[PDB]
Amino acid sequence: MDPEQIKTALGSGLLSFPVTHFDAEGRFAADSYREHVEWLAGYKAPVLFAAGGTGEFFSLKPDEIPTIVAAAKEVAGETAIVSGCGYGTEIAVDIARSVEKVGADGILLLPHYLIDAPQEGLYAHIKKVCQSVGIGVMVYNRDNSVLQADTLARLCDECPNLVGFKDGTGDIGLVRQITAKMGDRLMYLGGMPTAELFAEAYLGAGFTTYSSAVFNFVPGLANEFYAALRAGERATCERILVDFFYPFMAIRNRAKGYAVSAVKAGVRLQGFNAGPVRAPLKDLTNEEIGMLEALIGTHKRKAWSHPQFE
Amino acid sequence: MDPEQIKTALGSGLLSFPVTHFDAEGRFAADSYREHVEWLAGYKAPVLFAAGGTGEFFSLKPDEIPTIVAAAKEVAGETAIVSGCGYGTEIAVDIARSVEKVGADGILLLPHYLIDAPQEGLYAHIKKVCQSVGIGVMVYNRDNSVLQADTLARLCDECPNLVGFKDGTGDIGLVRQITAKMGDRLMYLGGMPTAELFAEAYLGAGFTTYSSAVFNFVPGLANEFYAALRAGERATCERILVDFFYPFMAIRNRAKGYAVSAVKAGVRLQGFNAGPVRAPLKDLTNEEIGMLEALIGTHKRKAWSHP
Amino acid sequence: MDPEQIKTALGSGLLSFPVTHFDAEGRFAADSYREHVEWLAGYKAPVLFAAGGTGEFFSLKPDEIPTIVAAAKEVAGETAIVSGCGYGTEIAVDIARSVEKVGADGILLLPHYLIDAPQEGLYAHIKKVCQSVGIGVMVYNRDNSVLQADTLARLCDECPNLVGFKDGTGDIGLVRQITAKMGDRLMYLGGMPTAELFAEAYLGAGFTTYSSAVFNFVPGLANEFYAALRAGERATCERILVDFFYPFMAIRNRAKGYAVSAVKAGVRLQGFNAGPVRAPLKDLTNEEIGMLEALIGTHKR
Amino acid sequence: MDPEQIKTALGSGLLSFPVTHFDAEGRFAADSYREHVEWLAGYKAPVLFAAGGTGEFFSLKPDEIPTIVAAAKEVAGETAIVSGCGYGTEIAVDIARSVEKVGADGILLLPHYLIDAPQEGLYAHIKKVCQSVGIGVMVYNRDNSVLQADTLARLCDECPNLVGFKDGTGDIGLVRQITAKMGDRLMYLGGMPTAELFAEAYLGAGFTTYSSAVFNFVPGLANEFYAALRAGERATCERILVDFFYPFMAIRNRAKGYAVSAVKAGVRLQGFNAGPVRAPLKDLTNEEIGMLEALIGTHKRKA
């Protein structure tokens, strides 16, 4: 679709970022990925971000990315498919073009690699990536790539296909300035690692959607929180925070990278064997997986038959 | 008043934190302060925080604090008066007791001095301060004193006079967890330096008021923003952010400590003789004062205005 | 003594920062403090910093500080006594004058309270404190008070009694620039938490002494490390780092504030009634105390 | 060469990290690169790191890296050539094998991309990269990849070809612990931005060499500072800090990324056609290039 069409889709509901499934040999496992994506499809997120951060973008070989996007497209139905993109300009442009070729509906541009950069340089980098494709682009303020409002305004003026802004900084002061400056020129996407913890505050900042990483494994719970958020049903949001999210955060905070690793464990627990994380992430221990299983609780989508003899 | 009465007052509108006025010899200028407070009183903030951060608490001798509190109380009218308090436990308790004696309605407890401390030590320190007085206490999460939700819950269960929570961290994740845990047990006060920049977001976090430092010198504009915030008039809030607050931020960001220095400059520009900041703050350059004067623009205090 | 005399003493050996002793009722325990200081004097540190950071300066009432300085002065002999000082300018000046009155040979100026400040403001604050007394002053780069080299040079030109510079930032780039700019105008004092971990690197930066917090309870070992440092005996320094300091660091890193709490625990283990730390610090658990005792081993008194 | 031979070379002098030359269109300019590398070779650094950080590794396509390494090898003479490597494991292994194939003598492993990672994950990633090649590996503690001493010891026990450790953290406390733990098992390389500012302190930490980015454009000055350093000639080191390095640092601190951009400007000022930086770095302004030219001063290579 064209950039205005993906822009519309971004404003039409909750955003899905599926984990990328690997086999025991570490290879992309398309059959498993498709099974999981097809299940998620019944929950009707309007945009699916393949090979995003929750999808371990940062551990994929660039040649894997179009393959993953194409697999998601097979089963995503009437859903917009956005691909992760990133690294320095030369690599990012090659990835962007390769996923445009395989029919992505947009790109989410993760930070360039390693260095701190001046605003003028961020401008030049992001402009070059946006101009390399005709599909829609969402920028992603996080880590070593944080656009100021004036720089983002210049990008918006010179790149019509730049239609979205995702925040991973948690800097309310800055993101409210950005929405004040750009208004409806961009769709504003919450991007903190467990975004429900920020969503009520982010409404005031001007953001009415976000990536729900936990939608990977408790989509019914994530959809309910989202509906409650949009309806102003504070007591419902709060109950779900207290009973699910803060306990999840306690598991997630046990080690670096668990914002991804714990989500992938949840997916496995729900009966999709998404496989291990790639180093340098590490998987949850069997004990920690058990903690997450207990938390999922009434939201389990199956029962397991654990091995036993006599 | 009793802690429940200050608690109620904290929930009744916008919070005022007056700058502390100093004279030529560097001393607290009580006439000028009282004059400024009396003018501010016309703009009807329900709570006045004397000798808070904006009031340069961190540069006051402890014996100056009761003098300043007493001065505000003289001319503040039917307005709750909360005093700054801070430092390590031994100093904080002395300060707290001294301001209770001159009729403070509460204390805002700024961080202890210098060190990083374990949660259980924060708990011990804050508990001792709360237990040293009968008036209401508001804790203040910022810098080297950041309470987690569980620690704060323990304090609330053991110190009935602990009735307010100010945030200066900007950590949305944490403050939402805090309001979810405590609910109406505490009043939640926004406390980022230029808090209007955060107010709309903080509503969703569970906070419906904040310290407006700029109320010191453009109380009308600060009231206009607050009214629009509480009414859900986003376009009005946004106009004021774009036309006044982001330009103010550009000035504030030119040097460390300007969150206080630029406010004091604004007060002097509006004709209240607030004097210099105390070191280690510095005052704005004449160029910067000029920038603030232009920004104040149509909100300039005029000789022909009616009180 | 005059600032040039405290300056010379700062360059004559290892620096001692005794913990401040408190009794059951929570007051300063002068008898206990004096007993501990008198024992430490046997180990011959040329300068003793009373009510510094390790001495819980940040938890003391301003009127306690002269009492502590006076107690140290009673028993320290031919040792220079520097007092902690800090907070904002009005409080700092009052402390500085009060300790000069009871005979402090110098002050160590800890950061002002709470706020981040511009260089021009740090200049104004520090200058006012220096000009309030005749005794020597050491500034202390740490936390919210970090002087750049040009600002410190201005202070040195203006304030003859400013004679020392203590670093607690660990910013090797900055401290080398400072020593290159000022040269022998100042004495350079290492001030990281557990400064032996930094001492060999700090030699190259231009610093040949530091505060040894562990001198509080293993003064002999601290002296052994220092002598090896100055003699260039790397294998000896390294043995002591591996066998004592990194294991100590492992205990210290178990909780915030243990850079002070663990040292105080060590002092109590050597039979001095130093008492508890003041909140918001917390004391070591019994388990942790046991670990420290085992580590101290044959250095037990 | 074998890992022990590259290890010996790392301990034999100063380390050179040439900027990667680009044409106006941003493409690798091999002829200009080789001219500059040949000029630097007269100053006898024992190891040349091609496509390191100063060489804009982070802006190169993986397929460019072997071409740059091969270019350096043409003209570097009897000099060990180490290639940059980095990113996540899948990319890093392919880069490592590609530069081994063009005859690199080692790899310097820059951080993986983007994420914070647990120590056990860093271990697994770095082990897989080390085991993918037979040439020497230097790890690089920087940003989102900071090995603790115990993790590094595990890697050293498992990976005999891991022979060097470069520090970009400035964490003196940690690096001294690492040298105390590993001793002569590793060669210790200073890796801060403008490393001469740290070199005297780093001696005490156990480091006797470092990357000299400014060697790109004032190699005589860099060699003299290094010689004074190893001779214990403090007044000479200090004079060069005061007269050259602190003024350079003032230019460097004007904008993000200038640790690379200012060095590349210096190379251009000395008459080599190094070209622009790639975004998201930016080049110095005309005003700043004038400042640097004035600073180079008596050390100009030509008029």
UniProtKB/Swiss-Prot annotation, chain C:
Gene3D superfamilies: Aldolase class I. InterPro entries: Aldolase_TIM, DapA-like, Dehydro-deoxyglucarate_dehyd. Keywords: Lyase. Its EC number is 4.2.1.41. One of its GO terms (molecular function) is 4-hydroxy-tetrahydrodipicolinate synthase activity. GO terms for biological process: D-glucarate catabolic process. CDD domains: KDGDH. It comes from the Bacteria. It catalyses: 5-dehydro-4-deoxy-D-glucarate + H(+) = 2,5-dioxopentanoate + CO2 + H2O. Transmembrane segments: none annotated. Pathway: Carbohydrate acid metabolism; D-glucarate degradation; 2,5-dioxopentanoate from D-glucarate: step 2/2. The keyword Lyase applies. Coiled coil: none annotated. The keyword Zinc does not apply. Belongs to the DapA family. This is Probable 5-dehydro-4-deoxyglucarate dehydratase.
